[PDB]
Design a binder for this molecule. Structure first.
Ligand code: C8E
Ligand code: C8E
Ligand code: C8E
Ligand code: C8E
Ligand code: C8E
Ligand code: C8E
Ligand code: C8E
Ligand code: C8E
Ligand code: C8E
Ligand code: C8E
Ligand code: C8E
Ligand code: C8E
Ligand code: C8E
Ligand code: C8E
Ligand code: C8E
Ligand code: C8E
Ligand code: C8E
Ligand code: C8E
Lengths: 472, 473, 472
């Protein structure tokens, strides 16, 4: 039987509300997430970049290895349920003393002892010490599977979000490229006018200050682009030359409708990998409580031998050397003065720690779901605000250029109008790809399509087809 | 009875100075910290959210469990100081070969052996191998207690500072709400004037750009508010609906004076939990050095049996089957070619590592104290600066509005003056609660009222009264 | 013999390109790095603070101890290759039952048994179980040496970059100090003029607003200074009073050319300590594969005794009590139902994990090298942009001050011109010391002068002469 205590996970009680992540003019959605959710961005550059991650990402490989390690440990603990067989052979020579109690000859005794045979050893699993040890590893392996799914979701999400940050950086670098192009022209015009006394030193300094400031901002954008370029290569590449010299082809993100949840699911506990992993790690420690409690109970051991024994090597495999034995041992602790009690206590405390870990995983998840839903619909508003702001500042700049060209506006006010448009355009870019990443955060928080009910082992094998483990 | 070396912790030598964190017009204070320092903010909402943390925080629960685990290991190692008693029963059958040296009959020998009785097993702790193993665990438990105190202070401080960051987020959001409302009114006016030809396309675009900019800044403030709301929920709540849908009632921080240190304490080593924890972990490793050195010395093992033995089961508990034995065994390593010597070295290096960890904890603590004190008084100055700045920019706005309404100021200049007030108002909010959190940092750096000399176990039990451990009850 | 598999590390294939980190008007360089590279900043204040770090930094001490611990473990595993010798002595008194099989006297038997002598125990390392255990620990020690070199490079680089961040903070605090002094006088003038009706409330408010704003920015700069002051103290100091009360003498960074790589080295694998560490940790796990595989093969044990035995303590060391024995024992597992096989799998997977760790180290390293090179040459361009920008905004301020003093410019146009100069000066400060730290990033990413071919143990001993281990 088994001494494992009944595992009582309290029900997660919460209300559903699909208006939580939906704007008033938006459709309330609780639809499920597709497994390959990233293809809904209609970006083939992104698709190829994700496939590179699912192939080359080392963190994902480590998670796969951790899973295999857990399976290997599972196999080891299963063997403990079966009787072990070993072969042995020995030879020895001894001078037995005259005063030795086993010596009745009154003389010095020289003798040999040669042995050879098969050995049987088996601990009778009466109280489920070895079954629950095995079942603990089984729970551990399932936890490693869920941890792998969590790692896959994390790697894919990080890859998508780094990609969009990179595109964000390309757009800002390009918007700052032209802003510097015109800054060169504007200065060159005022430089020509200064040589003929058409502008003063003050205005020329303003034109020059604008030129250098734009150049400084331009190079900052290049730097910011390089950072996310590096971050994407590290997540996806295995080619050292690609990492060193190559760049990344990309596609501008344009606003569209996304089939993502707008409220928390009724089966969220079965849809997040980390929750499932945390669950399995709890029952793992629960089985280990049973293992610890068997120490209070009697242990039964079976030993057997079949082979040969002789005082002479020449007669070792003779008929007169044939020997065997079989034995059962029954040991039972009486007073260990708290040793076993505190060990069971320690096992119970490890379960408590696993339970608290589970609760914290639950709290954090629900915290992530709340923010992700609110952030998505809030940034959605920002998309309209930043778009309209950029258009307004662009129109202001257009009128400013007209007035400046016919001397009806100072250079200072004209330069300010340019900067304001630049800021608005950059801000709109930042909002645009913050919204793209906000879609990912929602998908990430809801599990990315993971379902605990499905065949976890079969799903993992199918989705890990292209994982590069050629190294072994 | 012990091979543990003398533990020689060098003294921490430093000068005291109560002007380090005190302004020239401020009183230099070296008063101690009350256990529940957070109630001096006079915020009932803050008090409630701290109690929720002390009740529901899972990191606090983990720290409590880690302490209980250390107590359990302490109980395990205590048992090794006492003789163990076990019961045993066995039965075996054997075909002893003719050629077996033990066989004198010249014939195949079948025989049985049945045993049953009580067993004694006791390791004589001549050199304190098990005494120091116990003492190491005792120091490990004491370290877990100090780690719990450190975790408690950390959880409380984080909860308080998250609360204030949340209130800061509410204030900026509300300020940006009004800034958005009037900006919408500004555009509505300029939109009406446009259709009757009272304003140009240029001015209408400026009013619209201002409207969208404010709306963008507004939603950012909401987003920043939601971020700290989530942070507070995770720290204090065990209700999933509360986490998902509820908000947080709060109270604006008003500038008062707090009874906090302005200079480093003369007993700072006894007032920080992390220093005490780091200390106990050092003595723990020191005891383990002694344990490792006992391997060089002779070990003595005592065994005893009282029970029965017979070649037949039917006479197993008969009188002629009664038997007993008592045994002692000395073992002494002679040549192990560095095995034991390097194990002692390894144990001594573990102690060195714990010493370096202690030094680093000391250095970090003093660094935190310096910054916390200087930051507190510097941000105190910033409070007056940001308040006066906000008032000046507000008066500027009030005049700029009067002038714009009678057409004596361009819309652009008017929108700018208004944006400047908003910036100054937000900046003052940020300074206000950065000062509130600066108070906490000082309190945190000085241990939050912890005193090592007190009964830690009694204190821990008293202060963990409301800790929710009902999941195992 | 050994059962360790042949380790096959794939070649790191990549192209060289000295233009990667070189501007068009710079000389492309592939020159190696001097081991004390920080002295090329010509800063004596920086030199003393690095020496303090190399003496007092606790992370550096921990890495030194970790190396010593690995050395101790190596000594332990060396001993397992040699026969052990132990002394023993025992005494037992037993009432042997009448029914006991060994008792053929028909009556209760009381008897003693006393033993004393030297014991031999030796595991014949036929399959390299203990030799590869030893060789694994040796690789572990060499890995710890490289980890120390990596820690040394890390501590030094952090100390230098923290120093430059501190000087950046001091320079900005000084710039905001003088800006505060000017703002205090500007307000004082307007305050005087106000009470004689020479300026209005609107202008006075602008003067006060500018004054309080500068005061807020000034005190913020102090805070930023104190933060990097603390960070430097923790990295370098062991004196509590110094940490609490003292400040840091410094030296302004002046632009100069530095002899650093502009392209990736052809021997970068031998120049980065962290790569060498990952390599050694891989061979370590490789040797352990062999160790695990020895469990399949027969273990041979040698046992010996030389001493005494008697049923009487009075005759224990007499001639008739002299006894000895010698023996060999073979053990060979037959059926273990996966236990050993899965243990080998587990060991194989630990090697795979170490391989993935190595690969990830390579990818990260090449990513760091790419960014460090591009950042260096880009911030180099920014240096000229920020310098020219600051000088332009300074000239604008000078002309603006002239016009304001004769009433030909409004107060807030003059205050704006002041703030713009301050911003440009602070920005140029940030760029200046971001460039200094960009130099360090390049040196750091290239190993900081480390060469794997050199006598690692000799180098470590020589470069750690000032490491304060006086506590022991
Ligand atoms: C690596 C080598 C290990 C040691 C080998 C020692 C050499 C073996 O010597 C053999 C001696 O043989 C005699 C044994 O017994 C002799 C007396 O009694 C025999 C009974 O008739
Ligand atoms: C019919 C009566 C039952 C017993 C008769 C058994 C016949 C003989 O079986 C002997 C089998 O012995 C096994 C010997 O094992 C070899 C050990 O090798 C281990 C090597 O290191
Ligand atoms: C790994 C191999 C272990 C093999 C163990 C075999 C033990 C056999 O036990 C048999 C004893 O049970 C009762 C039978 O004894 C025979 C008595 O009569 C013999 C005929 O004269
Ligand atoms: C690894 C080595 C395994 C050796 C296995 C040996 C198996 C053979 O067993 C047969 C024994 O019987 C043979 C006959 O012997 C007759 C002896 O009679 C006289 C008394 O000793
Ligand atoms: C893994 C295989 C285990 C084999 C078990 C063998 C059990 C032996 O049975 C013994 C029964 O009784 C012993 C007498 O047998 C006949 C007497 O003479 C023949 C001896 O080989
Ligand atoms: C799963 C249970 C274990 C396997 C089956 C047990 C086999 C039963 O064997 C019983 C026969 O042996 C009886 C004892 O024989 C002793 C011979 O000597 C007689 C004189 O005392
Ligand atoms: C001169 C000395 C007096 C002799 C007194 C004899 C008392 C015998 O005590 C032996 C009891 O044996 C203990 C049984 O072991 C139990 C093992 O399994 C657990 C079952 O409950
Ligand atoms: C857990 C139970 C352990 C029981 C240990 C039993 C030890 C008792 O024996 C020790 C006494 O020493 C010898 C005394 O005998 C005296 C001689 O008696 C002979 C009478 O003719
Ligand atoms: C946990 C209980 C352990 C009990 C230990 C006591 C063992 C008794 O030892 C007695 C030693 O010698 C005295 C008795 O001698 C033998 C008894 O019969 C004598 C003649 O009638
Ligand atoms: C799978 C469970 C098998 C249980 C077997 C237990 C092993 C113990 O065997 C011991 C030997 O059996 C002895 C049989 O004969 C007993 C006779 O007792 C009185 C005669 O001297
Ligand atoms: C948990 C099991 C404990 C069993 C305790 C048994 C105690 C009873 O002891 C009885 C002793 O007296 C029996 C009388 O025997 C006299 C004849 O002996 C002759 C030799 O065989
Ligand atoms: C706490 C330690 C208590 C002492 C334990 C010592 C180990 C027990 O040894 C048992 C045997 O004692 C033998 C006593 O008599 C010895 C006489 O020797 C022969 C004289 O002719
Ligand atoms: C707490 C310390 C251990 C307890 C010691 C108990 C007292 C030991 O007494 C020892 C003296 O007795 C010597 C042996 O006596 C019996 C021998 O009988 C046969 C003599 O030839
Ligand atoms: C041909 C053989 C020559 C005879 C040589 C006899 C040498 C005997 O050596 C025995 C030495 O015994 C040492 C045992 O030490 C006891 C363990 O504990 C010691 C603590 O002080
Ligand atoms: C820790 C020390 C272990 C010492 C082991 C000693 C082993 C002795 O080996 C010698 C055995 O080899 C054969 C010797 O026998 C010769 C017979 O001579 C008898 C004289 O009449
Ligand atoms: C630690 C090294 C110890 C070495 C022990 C060597 C063992 C001695 O060799 C055994 C030789 O066997 C022959 C017996 O010797 C005769 C007995 O004493 C002399 C009487 O004639
Ligand atoms: C730490 C304790 C070590 C003890 C070592 C003891 C070694 C002494 O050996 C002495 C051997 O000489 C024996 C002399 O007497 C011989 C008597 O022979 C007569 C028959 O018994
Ligand atoms: C480092 C290698 C050491 C090798 C030792 C192996 C284990 C020792 O085994 C001893 C076996 O003794 C038997 C040999 O002597 C037999 C003599 O008989 C001869 C006449 O029948």
């Amino acid at each position: 039987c088994s001494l494992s205590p009944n595992l009582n996970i309290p029900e997660a009680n919460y209300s559903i509300d699909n208006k939580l992540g939906a704007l008033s003019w938006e459709k309330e959605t609780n639809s499920s997430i597709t497994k390959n959710w990233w293809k809904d961005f209609d970006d083939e550059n992104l698709n190829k970049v994700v496939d590179l991650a699912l192939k080359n990402n080392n963190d994902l490989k480590l998670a796969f290895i951790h899973m295999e390690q857990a399976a290997a440990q599972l196999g080891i603990d299963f063997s403990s349920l079966l009787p072990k067989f070993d072969g042995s052979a020995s030879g020895s020579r001894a001078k037995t003393a005259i005063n030795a109690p086993s010596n009745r000859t009154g003389e010095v005794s020289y003798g040999n002892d040669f042995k050879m045979g098969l050995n049987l050893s088996y601990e009778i699993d009466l109280w489920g010490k070895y079954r629950d040890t095995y079942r603990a590893s089984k729970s551990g392996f399932k936890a490693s599977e869920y941890d792998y799914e969590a790692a896959r979701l994390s790697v894919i999400s990080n890859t998508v979000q780094t990609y969009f940050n990179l595109v964000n950086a390309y757009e800002n670098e390009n918007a700052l490229k032209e802003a510097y192009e015109s800054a060169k022209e504007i200065y060159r015009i005022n430089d020509e006018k200064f040589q003929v006394g058409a502008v003063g030193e003050y205005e020329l300094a303003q034109a020059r200050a604008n030129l250098e400031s734009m150049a400084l901002q331009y190079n900052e954008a290049k730097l910011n682009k390089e950072n996310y370029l590096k971050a994407l290569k590290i997540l996806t590449s295995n080619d050292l030359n690609d990492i060193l010299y190559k760049n990344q082809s990309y596609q501008v993100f344009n606003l569209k409708e996304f089939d993502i949840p707008t409220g928390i699911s009724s089966t969220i506990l079965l849809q997040r990998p980390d929750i499932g992993s945390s669950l399995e790690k709890l029952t793992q420690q629960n089985y280990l409580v049973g293992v610890a409690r068997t120490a209070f109970l009697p242990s039964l051991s079976l030993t057997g031998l079949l082979g040969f024994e002789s005082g002479d090597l020449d007669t070792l495999v003779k008929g007169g050397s044939k020997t065997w034995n079989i034995g059962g041992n029954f040991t039972l602790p009486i007073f260990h003065w708290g040793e076993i009690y505190q060990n069971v206590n320690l096992a119970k405390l490890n379960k408590d720690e696993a339970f608290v870990n589970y609760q914290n995983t639950l709290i954090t998840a629900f915290g992530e779901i709340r923010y992700a839903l609110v952030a998505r619909k809030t940034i959605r508003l920002q998309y309209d605000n930043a778009q309209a702001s950029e258009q307004s500042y662009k129109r202001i700049y257009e009128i400013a250029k007209e007035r400046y060209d016919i001397g009806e506006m100072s250079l200072q006010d004209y330069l300010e109008a340019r900067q304001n448009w630049l800021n608005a355009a950059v801000a709109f870019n930042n909002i645009k790809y913050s919204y793209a990443n906000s879609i990912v955060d929602v998908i990430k928080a809801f599990g990315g399509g993971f379902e605990q009910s499905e065949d976890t082992s079969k799903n993992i094998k199918e989705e890990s087809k292209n994982l590069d483990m050629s190294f072994r």
